[PDB]
Design a binder for this molecule. Structure first.
Ligand SMILES: Nc1ncnc2c1ncn2[C@@H]1O[C@H](COP(=O)(O)OP(=O)(O)OP(=O)(O)O)[C@@H](O)[C@H]1O
Ligand SMILES: Nc1ncnc2c1ncn2[C@@H]1O[C@H](COP(=O)(O)OP(=O)(O)OP(=O)(O)O)[C@@H](O)[C@H]1O
Ligand SMILES: [Mg+2]
Ligand SMILES: [Mg+2]
Lengths: 83, 638, 184, 638
């Protein structure tokens, strides 16, 4: 029952880690911008053996943890206040 | 140096107490593990039949039966699964932390297309939470029927069975504890099955003792009626969406939500990768009467893993403003705790949370292309879209396009901001909007006179929440949101208009001083209006102060703090119409006499009217009423 | 039933440079304390702020103070920007001690109520001196009831040497010891 | 029949995996368990020395020392507690579900002062959450020094230790995994210890990086950091209340809450009986600026069991109207789960909730006897009292007596309801109250004219929350809460008054009918006013309908649909003053001519004015303003 895979997760918009004297939206935006910056510098540095280790050790994030398995969205056509 | 090596050991008696008392918080979860193990056995017997159908010669019916009996206090579960051999029963039931299911899967080849529930090997002992003595009846095809029994005293007894030949499967018998007799009431068994095991892969039967006369009255009375509708609603989310009809979606929604009306729309999507799950969402046709009530439950999105229920109201998966969403989510890889109630990594929930919000936004975007249905959606859930503006700063841009309002040129139709900008002139740079209580009030206000007469469309705000949303919604599509009720309302004017306005200021300069000294403190400045055409005067607000409709909303909230209301209180400015006849007469009279008491009374009454016309509540309605009573005495001659 | 309220507020810049609200000495000290705490937590999470000024910090309801409030919930303004940031010499001169200097200008606003280098009507001339080290915040303009500990603290923060500016836990330590001596 | 008996067994590797990955959601708990065990050893030697003082000859100082080492990644824990013999070493570290501490209290006789926390015998294995290998140095008084080492691979090594002599105690060295250097951060360690083991009754010294300012003639200062205590704040709640002074409470409150001011008041108590716990409560001197911000922690009372932190906020402890209360609760008898992060029995919490609510109400009752401190309390927390009126059904009786209000004869000082009960007229039967936006606006209302002239005291209502109170606060001390803004305002009347009333009705009946025809639907009826002297007419509401302020409060809410709640909106009744000269002259004009355009203009103007004086908004301010502008042209001869 190895659970080591999921223990590295980083989520910016987390209310649990918030400071009462900081604007929550601004802090979330700051965290998101920091995430964008770190993944953008990481790829530029990527383009080497030590480089290979840190990618495997990064906290998984929403963008990288999984991908979409496509399914259908529909609209229900039924007469409101029918005759 | 001499090193001694020893292997770790375990105390069985203390381990039993730990697994009994410190593992499972809720007693009712005991039934979930039993149904899970029965489904395990049924899947085992089914899978081998895919290669050798002759296995099912002992029995072809895959089912689970629950047979409560209040007379002896025995809660018995019978299933037709794989069964046990003696080696299997000893190895699995006698060894804590050993699960035969995990070994079975590890023995199977890669890609078996069968996923099972139990892995820890301790779920079975949860039966001791409510049972003091457990007897298990099982029979494997390659073996004989045996008897298994224990009282959780650290030892168990195994013996051969010569009773009724069960054929194939397992029969679990639990002698209920005396104070746990409430679990014999059929209602709670139905509730527990629907709550936790609604979507098991095999039909579950329930035999109930309803009638006491046996084969007596005119008709033949049967003591037991077999009830099958316990897991009838089959998990359509498991099937491919392309093969599901709209009627199937409606039936699933009605079964899940007990609604008599159909859904408005269905959103179905799955996610693949390290975190894999399937989701199926519904939009109710009517807004619930208690949608924003505080004392009630936050969310109605139910969580599943491998078709077993985990958590009903998980606060971490959706925000408040999307609480009306109905649906279920099922996964296959979530790391569960020892009780299969929480997750060993809570940040997983916040990863599922991020995608589902995006999917709901996509679904709401997919509703807007059909105006007729989207009109009903807007009518039922205008508030939820607006409330999400103020809190979800991340999705504010996308949610803005989903807004519709009455405008000065839309008539009775609600129109989007995109239509509003599309209908604007080349010279206009701002979205002129007006807040108020009703469409007719904001339409008939004296401020919109010059705005309307110059052909500029104005949005009408009538809901109280409109002031909150425009606070963050400073600009849309690069166009600033400008309220014409405030000072500095800029209109594109020619040189002649500017010259006429300047002549008005220079002509009325001293008169403005006369007003200002007459009113003293109530008005900060008196200026010649550039927004009025017919009405003599109006009260406009400061550039950054609270608007007229705003402070009324602020002054009416029950729990706000009054220590700050001094700071953002806007300062009142009195704009005056240069071309009004009454203002010209007052100018002449003031020039004739600066100390005319009649002029003072006219100015005070006119300002009192201006406050009322601008929407401001009077500081004292009584003095204005007394002034008007005095005046009508003069008009009548009293 | 009852309903909720939400996040609305107003900035220090508007309050003091426009409304000129007469904040009490303890109130100004409390804004100092909360700003220092919010800065420390920002630095505790190795986050850097680059445009500290009364415009970007807001007094919320109940006199709550919310850093990052770009609105109710460096565009010039160099009077807060530290000299080492001003010369643009380093590729990223922004640092924790640059934020210390900017927050020291914030304390200057708190304890004086007027923008630093007020005697100057040219921004570029202010640029030229404060960048070269010719101009310092005029610490004599602090209020007459100013405690000595805060005065020395703001002096340390506006010190032109970035390394000498004490790091934010030292700022909070300096405030609390004076803060407990306030009722004198 | 042959019955075979077997004893239950367990798989060691799977049990280790379950303990590691399944029981603890957060990894930071490993420090908590280590501190708990070190304190257990320290209390063991302390109790042993209480009987044999020579036991401490190997060491006199009792403490826990933490030696993080970022260079070697070794998190060294050294405590001067009891050492291990080889038999104790193996029996305690190699045996799962075996607690030497549990055996220790099971060995002790009844009556000993014991705060032991270690019971499950598995907390030590939590070190493997962050450490791949555990290194233990142990030295008991009756045994030599030994080495124990394992990597959770199912086996451990035991050998004699010949390194640095420890004398007595235990030295745990953890080889932290490379991904978990966070626990070597000094700030992280301080956060964890203050969060979990802040109130351990032994000095915790944490030794960290060098304190050197580098300029030998250079300054070096200390080539390390000697920090001597992180648990400086002693658990004063464990002490008796009588021996604690105000300064101690203030320092403790400032330590916990980081506040710079003192408490407003303190309440310290314990609860005995079938459950034992202690509770220390603080009320801040100032309202928390985010008291009703709902996105963050609702309840702010921290929970402790045997002086180790359990959980920070449980919604079953305090309601929303008590969110301002500060304090901590410590208990000794709650059975925690295996993870100690959640209480398995929620029935107990409700009893604690009841007791704490009762005692907080008692404390608030104590404050009221001292007016000035209670005046500060009321100013800072008036809203929460009224929310408690609204929601707390049971305590509404005592909660009502805590309300202070300005009255018509109270001047500027606010008065309690009981003070109003101190001042009835003998005939007066109802507590007359009037709602509004400001004290001045209600002080001189037209409705309170006759009420004031007859010497009846009235209460001024100015906050929006007040209308919720009068919805629930219907009667107080058996006296009804009657508003003078509503119809049916029954005031003690004599025979002459009713005779005059009947004469006025007879005289004005035709006038009443003609105004009823002119005003049509805008008024449900027109009646002669029994409450007006100076105002010719005013608007009153229905017997059961909303007041103008109440309706404004409902329609100003941003999250409620006014269409659904609109059925209750009161009907408007026009109460005309019989003795008013304006009313009498209008009666004469109407009798002389019923279709007079002047008469209809006067009556519509008078009704529009009466709406404003009654707090109602105008259905269209623009038409009223145009009516004024037209009229005053006649005054100017325009
Ligand atoms: N009805 C059954 N059919 C097949 N095997 C069973 C049945 N009941 C018990 N067992 C076996 O006995 C062991 C039962 O326990 P438990 O229910 O304790 O384990 P799990 O279901 O395998 O794991 P977990 O504890 O994670 O749910 C199972 O792992 C399974 O091997
Ligand atoms: N540093 C120590 N000093 C003294 N005894 C210790 C120490 N570390 C471990 N032990 C002993 O090892 C035995 C096991 O404990 P663990 O720390 O394994 O669980 P617990 O403390 O017994 O209970 P729980 O699992 O409920 O926290 C303990 O009961 C304690 O007697
Ligand atoms: Mg199981
Ligand atoms: Mg332990």
């Amino acid at each position: 029952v190895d659970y080591s895979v999921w223990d590295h997760i980083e989520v910016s918009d987390d209310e649990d880690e918030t400071h009462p004297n900081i604007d929550t939206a601004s802090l979330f935006r700051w965290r998101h911008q920091a995430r964008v910056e770190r993944m953008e510098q990481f790829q530029k540095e990527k383009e080497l053996e030590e480089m290979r280790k840190k990618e495997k050790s990064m906290p998984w994030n929403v963008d990288t943890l999984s991908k979409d398995g496509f399914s259908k969205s529909m609209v229900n056509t039924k007469p409101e206040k029918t005759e | 140096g001499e090193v001694e090596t020893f292997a770790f050991q375990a105390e069985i008696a203390q381990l039993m107490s730990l697994i009994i008392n410190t593992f499972y918080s809720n007693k009712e979860i005991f039934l979930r593990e039993l149904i899970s193990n029965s489904s395990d056995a049924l899947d085992k017997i089914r899978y081998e039949s895919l290669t050798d159908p002759s296995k099912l010669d002992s029995g072809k019916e895959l089912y689970i039966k629950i047979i409560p009996n209040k007379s002896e206090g025995t809660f018995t579960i019978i299933d037709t699964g794989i069964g046990m051999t003696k080696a299997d029963l000893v190895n699995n039931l006698g060894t804590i932390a050993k699960s035969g299911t995990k070994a079975f899967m590890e023995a199977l080849q890669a890609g078996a297309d069968i996923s099972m529930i139990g892995q820890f090997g301790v779920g079975f002992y949860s039966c001791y939470l409510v049972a003091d003595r457990v007897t298990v009846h099982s029979k494997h095809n390659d073996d004989e029927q045996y008897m298994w029994e224990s009282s959780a005293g650290g030892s168990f007894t195994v013996r051969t069975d010569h009773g009724e030949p069960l054929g194939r499967g397992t029969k679990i018998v639990l002698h209920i504890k005396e104070d746990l007799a409430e679990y014999l009431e059929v209602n709670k068994i139905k509730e527990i099955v629907k709550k936790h095991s609604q979507f098991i892969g095999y039909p579950i039967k329930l035999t109930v003792e309803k009638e006491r006369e046996k084969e007596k009255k005119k008709t033949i009375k049967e003591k037991y009626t077999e009830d099958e509708e316990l897991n009838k609603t089959k998990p359509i989310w498991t099937r491919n969406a392309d093969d599901i009809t709209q009627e199937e979606y409606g039936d699933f929604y009605k079964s899940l939500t007990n609604d008599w009306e159909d859904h408005l729309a269905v959103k179905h999507f799955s996610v693949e990768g390290q975190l894999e799950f399937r989701a199926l969402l519904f939009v109710p046709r009517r807004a619930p009467f208690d949608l924003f009530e505080n004392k009630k439950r936050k969310n109605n999105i139910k969580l599943y893993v491998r078709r077993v229920f985990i958590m009903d109201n998980c606060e971490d998966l959706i925000p408040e403003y999307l609480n009306f969403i109905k649906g279920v989510v099922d996964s296959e890889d979530l790391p569960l705790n020892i009780s299969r109630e929480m997750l060993q990594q809570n940040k997983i929930l916040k990863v599922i949370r991020k995608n589902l919000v995006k999917k709901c936004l996509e679904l709401f975007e997919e509703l807007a292309e059909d105006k007729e249905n989207y009109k009903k959606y807007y009518e039922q859930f205008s508030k939820n879209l607006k409330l999400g503006i103020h809190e979800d700063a991340q999705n504010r841009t996308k949610l803005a396009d989903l807004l519709r309002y009455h405008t000065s040129a839309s008539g009775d139709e609600a129109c989007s901001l995109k239509e509003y900008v599309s209908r604007m002139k080349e010279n206009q740079k701002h979205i002129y909007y007006i807040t108020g209580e009703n469409r007719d009030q904001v339409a008939n206000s004296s401020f919109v006179e010059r705005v309307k007469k110059r052909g500029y469309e104005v949005v009408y705000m009538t809901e109280p929440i409109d002031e909150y949303v425009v606070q963050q919604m400073r600009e849309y599509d690069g166009k600033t949101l400008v309220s014409v009720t405030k000072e500095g309302l800029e209109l594109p004017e020619d040189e002649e208009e500017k010259k006429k306005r300047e002549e008005d200021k220079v002509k009325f300069e001293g008169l403005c001083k006369v007003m200002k000294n007459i009113l003293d403190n109530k008005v900060e400045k008196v200026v010649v209006s550039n927004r009025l055409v017919e009405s003599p005067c109006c009260i406009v607000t400061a550039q950054y102060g609270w608007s007229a409709n705003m402070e009324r909303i602020m002054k009416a909230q029950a729990l706000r703090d009054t220590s700050t209301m001094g700071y953002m209180a806007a300062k009142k400015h009195l704009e005056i119409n240069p071309d009004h006849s009454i203002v010209e007469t007052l100018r002449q009279k003031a020039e004739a006499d600066k100390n005319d008491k009649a002029v003072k009374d006219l100015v005070i009454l006119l300002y009192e009217t201006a406050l009322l016309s601008s929407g401001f509540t009077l500081d004292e309605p009584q003095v204005h009423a007394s002034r008007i009573y005095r005046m009508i005495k003069l008009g009548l001659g009293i | 039933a009852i309903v909720t309220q939400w996040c609305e507020g107003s900035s220090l810049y508007k309050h003091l440079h426009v409304q000129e609200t007469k904040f009490q000495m303890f109130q100004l000290i409390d804004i100092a304390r909360q700003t220092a705490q919010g800065m420390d937590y920002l630095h505790a999470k190795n986050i850097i702020h680059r445009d500290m000024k009364s415009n970007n910090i807001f007094l919320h309801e109940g006199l709550t103070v919310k850093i990052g409030d770009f609105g109710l919930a460096p565009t010039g303004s160099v009077l807060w920007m530290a000299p080492e940031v001003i010369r643009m010499q380093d590729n990223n001169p922004f640092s924790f001690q640059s934020d210390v200097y900017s927050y020291g200008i914030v304390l200057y606003e708190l304890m004086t109520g007027e923008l630093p280098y007020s005697h100057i009507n040219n921004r570029d001339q202010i640029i030229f001196m404060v960048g070269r080290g010719y101009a310092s915040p005029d610490l004599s303009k602090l209020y007459k009831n100013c405690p000595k500990a805060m005065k020395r603290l703001v002096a340390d923060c506006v010190k032109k040497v970035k390394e000498e500016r004490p790091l934010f836990p030292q700022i909070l330590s300096s405030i609390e010891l004076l803060q407990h001596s306030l009722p004198k």
